[PDB]
Design a protein around this nucleic acid. Sequence first.
RNA 1: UAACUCAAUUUGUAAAAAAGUUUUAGAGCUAGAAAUAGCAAGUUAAAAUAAGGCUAGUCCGUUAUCAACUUGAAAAAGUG
DNA 2: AATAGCATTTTTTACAAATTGAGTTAT
DNA 3: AAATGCTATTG
Length: 1308
Amino acid sequence: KKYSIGLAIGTNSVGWAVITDEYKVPSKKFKVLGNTDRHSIKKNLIGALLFDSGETAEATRLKRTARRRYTRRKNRILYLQEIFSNEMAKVDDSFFHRLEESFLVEEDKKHERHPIFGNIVDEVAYHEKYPTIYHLRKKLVDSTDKADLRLIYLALAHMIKFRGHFLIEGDLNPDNVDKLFIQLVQTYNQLFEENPINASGVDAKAILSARLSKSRRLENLIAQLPGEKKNGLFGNLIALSLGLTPNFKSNFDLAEDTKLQLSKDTYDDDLDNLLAQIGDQYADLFLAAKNLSDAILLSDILRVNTEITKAPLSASMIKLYDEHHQDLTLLKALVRQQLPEKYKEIFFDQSKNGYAGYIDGGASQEEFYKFIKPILEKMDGTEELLVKLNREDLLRKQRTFDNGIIPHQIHLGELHAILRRQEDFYPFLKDNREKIEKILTFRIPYYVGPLARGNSRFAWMTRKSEETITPWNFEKVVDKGASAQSFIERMTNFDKNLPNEKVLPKHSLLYEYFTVYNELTKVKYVTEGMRKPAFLSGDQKKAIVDLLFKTNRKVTVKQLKEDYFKKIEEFDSVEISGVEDRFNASLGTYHDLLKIIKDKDFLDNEENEDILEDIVLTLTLFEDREMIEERLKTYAHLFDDKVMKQLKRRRYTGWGRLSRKLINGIRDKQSGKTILDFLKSDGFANRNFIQLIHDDSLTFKEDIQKAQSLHEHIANLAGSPAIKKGILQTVKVVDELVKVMGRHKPENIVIEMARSRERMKRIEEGIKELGSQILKEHPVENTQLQNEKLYLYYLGRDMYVDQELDINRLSDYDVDAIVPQSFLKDDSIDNKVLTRSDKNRGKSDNVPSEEVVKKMKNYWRQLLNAKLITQRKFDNLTKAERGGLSELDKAGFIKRQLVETRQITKHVAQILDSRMNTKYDENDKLIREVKVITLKSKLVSDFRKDFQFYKVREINNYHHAHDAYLNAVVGTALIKKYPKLESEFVYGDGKATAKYFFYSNIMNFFKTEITKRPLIETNGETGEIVWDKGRDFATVRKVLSMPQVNIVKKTEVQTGGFSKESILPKRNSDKLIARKKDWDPKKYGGFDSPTVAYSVLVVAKVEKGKSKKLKSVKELLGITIMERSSFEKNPIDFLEAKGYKEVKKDLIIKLPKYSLFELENGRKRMLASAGVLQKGNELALPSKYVNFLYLASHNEQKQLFVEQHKHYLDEIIEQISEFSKRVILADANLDKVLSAYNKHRDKPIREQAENIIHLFTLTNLGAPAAFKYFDTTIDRKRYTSTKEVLDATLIHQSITGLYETRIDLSQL
RNA sequence: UAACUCAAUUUGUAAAAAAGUUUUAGAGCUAGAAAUAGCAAGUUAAAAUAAGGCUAGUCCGUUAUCAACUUGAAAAAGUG
DNA sequence: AATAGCATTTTTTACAAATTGAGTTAT
DNA sequence: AAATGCTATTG
């Protein structure tokens, strides 16, 4: 017979259902393979498939890239040791050996146990002399004394091993705050007597370098400068000091929007363009700002002078040490005096987050400071210690989270010192001073990637030499350019219309030309004389470009109607019917090159344009000046420096969507003009790009089609890989159902798809940039930012009257949606305006009145600049003053509310339709045997709420299956009752408020009570009956009442990390796992808690007693992710090695996670691991009870059904008890559930329902979970033994579950 | 459906950084047969950071994909 | 069996591709 | 961001 398919596609569940003609889902009696009593079983063709969320590639990428860093840092140290090799031997036989075995216990050590000197006395003395590595570093930088070759390696290696960041370009130097601010002032002063600025020199070191941020410290630095805008030149010179990218366009009235970034590798190149345009006399402004900006950077990383020591970092680290030494000594005597009884807790007990916990225990700085703060202020004579603790400067370590600020510049400055000292004493240091710096310096560029040799899936570089790559021969042995090119060319699109070809760059002239002449051709004009607006003159367009478009970047219709009509075609008033504002397509690259080339002869002529295409392609391709430099040398012979050196200055972003071939090249023989040249003159047709292709008169739409894997297809979908998993299983589900129907494709298919830590870092960052005074009466809670009344008030200034909404008034203050809930159903937040009242926003029957937009738009551009909300929020917000949600704007919001427009879903549709519709007809046209209907995600949600088919998720997993049914129902109906919409829902080929009245009344044809609808609703053409509100509305009721629903959970081998990542200390346990072959976890610790990949059923024997008497056994052994590859290679040896004797190789059942077992009384179990099970049972509460628990939780007429038919409780609790006692088996907890029910019967009607919905966690399928029953938590009763399963009935489901092989595990 | 303009999320890749943790090294001191007392110290470093693998690279090693049965190296097909 | 503690973090630069949602043009 | 299989301890 005929049938359809419904599908409910989520990230964790594909729901599926089959309906026949009478909206009925058939049963069907499938075989049962295996060795059980059952040969057969009748299942309904409804069900779901559950599965664990698919995951993104980020965690593996972060770890993969982290592992590339570790193996490099190692070779970074190896490069150093290789240098020191031959000379170190002469000093110490095996110094490098003693380091490499540092970690080994004394018992397994080959050399002395003291790594540095190889005996006790020297080593003890080394530490006594230089208590921190920084001491040695400093002393090696200052002292001129010939140093020990081992202490030189140990300073160099420390500087190389942890070498700080590569964020800042160029060479900053410790040249530094107030005495460099005076130089900026005196520079800006003696450039400008006439505009004078002064502040003397007192409070400079603080107002910049205070407790608060860097951006808000410009407001307390620059606003102190009375009669200067901080957004002027001297501000923008203090702006560069903090670390901004200002644009000095206005300041020196320069036409080009010149922007300078100080850390950028482009700044010295960006310095030349501003001085050569402003003069050389203004150099001392930048060359005195970079001094102060340096200061700004160093001022937070180092607390020393540079006048005494040439190692200001290492020195500054010693300073922290000595303060750490003093502050300790003091706090030692201060405890011995006032609280000598609490000395143990603070200095001896590691456990408590005291000092003793701070050092030898796991107490961080933040944790330690939070436990001493109340003991400081109590104990008098600790004034500075609180000042330190409140400045984060109390008892610092030299190795701390906030060492991230130190750039490699600072460490290289010291590494250079040491070498410059000891080369005088060591010949190999003098010769290799280049190499030893370069090991610190060199840094594989991101546009090269893994230095691989055809064995890295991810790599892409090109090898110029095949020899090994070192930091010193890199540019010799790697083709950096070619690699740098391939980095981009392996990601940018091909031409859709010609897949073999590659898209041109978004700023290519030949492209730029095409964009305009496609937008220009359709511009129609009307004057005083003309009677029907005439389209643009094919012949005359070449002037409109040369006159208006080649002249400026932006072409204005206002600057195109006024300039052209009035000065070209003696035309008074100019009305433009094609476009009314600024043109989208600009020739900007023509006006961008014409300023730099200063030749409209070369440009405009274009007798050879192929040279200029490379130039602009190179500017888009690379971002490194160094890369761009060489690449542009090919065309230096035509231009001097100022013409070919400002071309390294120009940089371009983006790629085009169309190739060069298509645009200019692929022509027609009949035509004899390209798509660009045909756009420039099409006579009296002036046809478009989309025209030019598809016009059957032209040969293009053929050429394109004629010149033009499930996993690949699904992979290629743009969408969360989490949804890409539901999509693949959907297609498998479908593939299987079709086979169940004797390989007979369906009539239709209906698809459907659903939709604190982030806050903390976003709010803190925002609170650092804002200057809000949050904290004054807004204490911190890391979690409670998910409070929506708290997140939207804050985001202390209320929206309606532009005042301050109170905390009690923030609960009473309304929250309006940006657009009424009728136009767009969107998450409350990104349209989440809270007003004093709704009566401020205006009429709810459209978008807010112009009056409030006229009123507040001047403030709406003060938070768009602050970037609080997207600019598309301000488009609708300002749409009252722009236009206003018209009766077409509303009809389109009410049409898209039911029609799926999301691209993922369309593809799901394209994929499914393509797979069903394979056969063709007489005239090469496709046969559409199966119709795929995409339905939005609120038809059924309404259909259920409207017609008493309510959903309660908590009860069981049927909702996903039920939805795929309803989705099938509505889908076949809305296609029967409106067949004209098979171009709107199906995949394949005042009147605005009348399209609205269609869309918004489409679903009313189900009803019976609108203000009188007929009983049998029919077709608007055929005599086909489509909905029989008498019969069909009780078949739907019937289906949701069906208790046997096919629920299946994907069986999945586990992948990912070997174990928990925590490196635990040494311990006596076989649960520890060695981090390294010869690293006995008795001695060295390791990991525990490995993830098992899958279990296997071993049937074999094990030796018993000293007799080695084989005793037979049958148990589950967990093959861990790390074990796995070993066990698969040779399962017998792996298992024999485990102690198993005479393994039955035929009986080794592979058991991945979620394997279902049927035990007795239909009690079912899913193995979660070798030694824990989870609830494999699903409870079907009858439909009667479901609708009760929804209303009981929660127009007037069905309320009475709650009070009446009440006490559905007593019978619910029962069904739960009868289930919990049969399959769950959590005696104590079911006795606490009952015991807590009976003592809450005097609690309201709703409350008892709200806790029964909490009760289903007990009976829910999957892992036991804790849950509350009123004010009584109920700890999870887990299943921590698989013994029972070993003699149960392993069930092998098919993806639907309709096919089963059941194996009774009474093997042995 | 296509190009176009403007501004948000999602996905994928590469290059870098700072910590954390683990063992060792940094002679603890007296008093006591010992348990235990008193006190002195404490900030640093080396090395490991998936076990590892062969393709031996300054590469690869945590994504995706997985009922059963028969057939296939696999992909996949066939089976009610 | 009931019971309880446990889980590696954070930061920067560079690029590409779709999507979504406000506009002009056309098939 | 929880959520849930390890780990160990208990009478």
